Each structure stands twice: as C-alpha cells, then as structure tokens.
Design a protein around this nucleic acid. Sequence first.
DNA 1: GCGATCACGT
DNA 2: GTACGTGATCGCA
Length: 577
Amino acid sequence: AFTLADRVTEEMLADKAALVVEVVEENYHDAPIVGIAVVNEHGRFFLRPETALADPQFVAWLGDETKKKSMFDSKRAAVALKWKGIELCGVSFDLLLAAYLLDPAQGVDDVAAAAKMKQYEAVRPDEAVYGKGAKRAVPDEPVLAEHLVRKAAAIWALERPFLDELRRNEQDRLLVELEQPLSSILAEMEFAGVKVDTKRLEQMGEELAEQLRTVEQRIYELAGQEFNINSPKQLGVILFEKLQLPVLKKTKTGYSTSADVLEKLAPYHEIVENILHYRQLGKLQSTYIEGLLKVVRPDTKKVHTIFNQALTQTGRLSSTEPNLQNIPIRLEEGRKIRQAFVPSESDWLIFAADYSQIELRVLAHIAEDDNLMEAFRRDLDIHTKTAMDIFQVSEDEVTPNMRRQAKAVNFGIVYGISDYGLAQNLNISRKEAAEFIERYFESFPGVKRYMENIVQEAKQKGYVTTLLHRRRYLPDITSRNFNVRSFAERMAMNTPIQGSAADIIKKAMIDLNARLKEERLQARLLLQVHDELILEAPKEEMERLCRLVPEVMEQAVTLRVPLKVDYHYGSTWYDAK
DNA sequence: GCGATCACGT
DNA sequence: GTACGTGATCGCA
C-alpha cells in the first residue's frame, strides 16, 4: 500500500527516490501537473500537486542536485515545472532513456512497456488509465494515486536491472554522460522557445492565398470543370478519365498523382504544370504557414517544440509541435519561411552552424577508405571528386549532370537508399544504377569492405553499433523475404553512419553548453535541426561565437578526417546563411 | 471521431 | 525504398 499524503514530511525528502511528476496532456508546455508520487527507503507517497508544489521544503528538495531522483521521461516533468518557476535537479536515472538505449525498436513509450522488458507487470499502461483520444480523461484520485505510485514503485524496482544491462552493453556512460545531460539541455531549449514574426508569416500566407486562387481558377479552366484539386481521387478522374492522360503509375486503390508522375505527364496538357504549382503553394500554405501559426503561443509569440529523444532507431532527435526539422530546404520560398524565425530580444541575432558532410566524413573514418579519407583531408568538393573517380575524368571535365549523378550516389549512402531507389532517383534502369554502384566501389574499395563487413557483423552479433555505442538490433537481416532482408542490410550499413553523426552532434551540444557558461556568454542554444545547431545571442557576442562555436563543434570527437563546420549569423534564421 | 491512404517535406 | 511529422481526404461506426 501507500500513504495518501496530506502534507510534505521529512521522510518524503530522502536523498534517493523514484519520482513521478505526472503531466497527462501530450504537449507538456505550460501544462497541469495532476499528481506526484515518491517512493524511497521510508515508504510510498502520493502528494497532491497544489500541496507539494507550494511547499518550500519539497521545492528545495526538487532543486537540490545532491538528492537523487529516478524518473521516467524527466524532461516532460522538468519543462512542466519550469513553466511553474520550479527547478528539477539531481535526476540521476531516466528509465525512458535507459530503455531507449537498450533497444530503440521496442517503442517504449510508458513505464509499463519498459517494465515488461524485465518481466515486471505490476503497473498499468498509461493508455489503460487515461483512455485514448476523445475519451481521454484524468481519473478519480484513488485510481490516479494508485497508478502514479505503481509507476514510481516500478521505476524504483527497475533501476538496477536496467543499469546492469547497460553496463554489459558498455552503454552506461552513454546514458549518464550523454543522453541524460542532453535531456536537461533540450529542456532548456524547449522552454526558451524560438520567437516567430507572426505578421511576416501572415503576410506570406496572404501572398500564397492570392497566388493559390489564381492557379486554382486556371486549373478549373483547363479542367473545364470545378473539383477538389486537393483530393487525389477527384484529380485522377479529371486527369486520367476526362483528359485521357497516360496512366504511368498505379496506386493501390486508383491512379498515382505524385509529383514524380505529374512531371512526366507535363508535355501532354497545360493543366499538369498548374497542378504542380498548386501542390507547391498549397503545401507551403497548409503545412508551414497555417501549421506554424497554430502552434505559436500568443502569450510569448514563440514556438516551443517538443524534442523526442527516445524515438528514432538511429539516435537522431525528432521534434514536434512544430517539427522544425521538416521546414523546406529546396525551393526559394521553401526556406524563406525561416525569415519568420527571429531573435527573441532587441539587438540579438541568430547564429547558425552546421557540419559539412558529417555523414560521409564519419563513413571515411569507419571504413578507413584511403581515397575517401584523402578527399576530406584535402577538403575537396566530395561530389565533384566522386564524379571524377566514377567517370575517370579530370576536374574540368566534370559536367553538371555528372556531378548530379555522383551526388545522388553519395546521398544514397548517407540515407541508405536501395539501388532501385537510386534508379528511381536518377530516372535510370536498375541495371544502370547497379553499374553506377560497382564503379563507385571500384573507386572506394574501403567503403565496399565496410558494407560487406558490417552486414556480416549484424548477422553474427544480431545488431550494429555507433561510435558512442548506441545499438540497433536487426532481426530481419536473416529473413527469407528479399525485400525484408535487403532493408535490414541497408540499415546495418546506414545506422553506424547516421547514428555516429547523431552521437557527435549530441556531444557537441553538451560541450557547447558547458563552454557558453564557462565563457559567461548570454548566447543560448535554440534548435538542433539535421546537422545544424541554431543559437541566438547579443550582437556584441557574434565575433566571439564565430571562433567558439565551430571550434567546439569541430573538436567534439577526433576522427581520422577533420570535421568541418560552416557558420553564419543574421537578423533571422533565413539570413543566418 | 478514428483509421487507412495518399502526398510531400525532411 | 532513411530517420520522421504533418495535412487532407475519404469512408467508415
């Protein structure tokens, strides 16, 4: 049983405890704390938050680094407490991050899922307690208090077996020196948020809305009819039924209207280019203008993203509400959305720094391919150099299309694309793509050795690892379905590359955070997107940041090839280019 | 109201 | 067809 507590007592404030600070709303920013449980050597306690969070001794305990707490998803609680003006310190074990590191494919999203990994089932899944979707609801205090106490008791019971397995995997330092410190840095970044120029966004959205209606009127002209252009079903009836355009690709219920297909239907009818333009404009208007404006807080005029640290199978961060990694990077108005992201104070600027080709540099290091390593030691343009070797031409003989094809081979490596995906990316046959790949391996035989050796290692051990000992289990590597086996082989090759790059960026973030405080700069980390870090800082700090940030990022790890960082600053994220 | 499906940005 | 997140439509109960 447990103590349903009236007031905070001294025995609730031991120097080691499992702690539950429950935030039930999915978006925890400025969200209610619905209850608190503490389990320690003296007992098990449920506290009402209006009581506990108004208690000086309990608040002092929360903020005391020397009182150690074990938790699940400590960042959710940290941020919810930041919005109440309360600091959470001393979190020495995060069970969500521990479960993530042990097996990211398990999907661990609550205490019960993690507990089941160790045959502990005396805790319910959150979904069984709070309900799903519309029916979601905080239950009565007796049901709530038992749930929170069972979650804390599970965290209390599970710390030792989880830490023991992490230690056997050589992942104990990964948890304690990388993922957990990063969790606190991410909490600060989310809480600070990023200032959005909403008038600029609304002005962009008004541009699009008038452009969209011009294109949309033109499409109804060439259609001889009005129809929902945003319905791929109705658009198929207009294209392939009414206008009798060739069906080149089939979807599983009707006709494909992908941008891939439409670009090749373009010579046949003027409607097609107008559909393509409508699709561009409408994606910007719906996903990025209206999408962003919906998640800007009117109190702060900021967006406060939520970074998901325990989701991807490579170790990269993901982010939501908004997903600021999805912001377009190709077109002109694509990245012009980034004009809307501004410093949060007068006379501050945005500073952005990004790793140049970190994935291919990591590959050069892991594969120890002499040709790849030398190209980076000479700081060559890697796509031009790849074209030179594959086609055996001098630099001045590399045509733009040759460089494009080499760049597509290189991107297929960074992102693990199939050779059918290479064919599909280059609009060539599978046989031609295969010959492309063999010429690459003729030029980079160390990369070929690495690809063969890592697949054999994944088959032997059952998993692959990154430079900082993240692992990914690959049970499909021995499957008899060719497509299932092939995807697992590509993941064996890709995860050490993408996940080691993720490791390096996370270590750079931790090193940068420490250096900024050591230097007593006001500069603050705001975002991590792709291979880039974004900060804001007083304009009087730019010259110092120009030396400090690239140095910290370049020295985060020592590889057989240099790490290279490009950096810029400006009055907006766009202009930090 | 929720799930499957399509499309598009990463 | 890499890692993912989002929006729109559709057609269910």
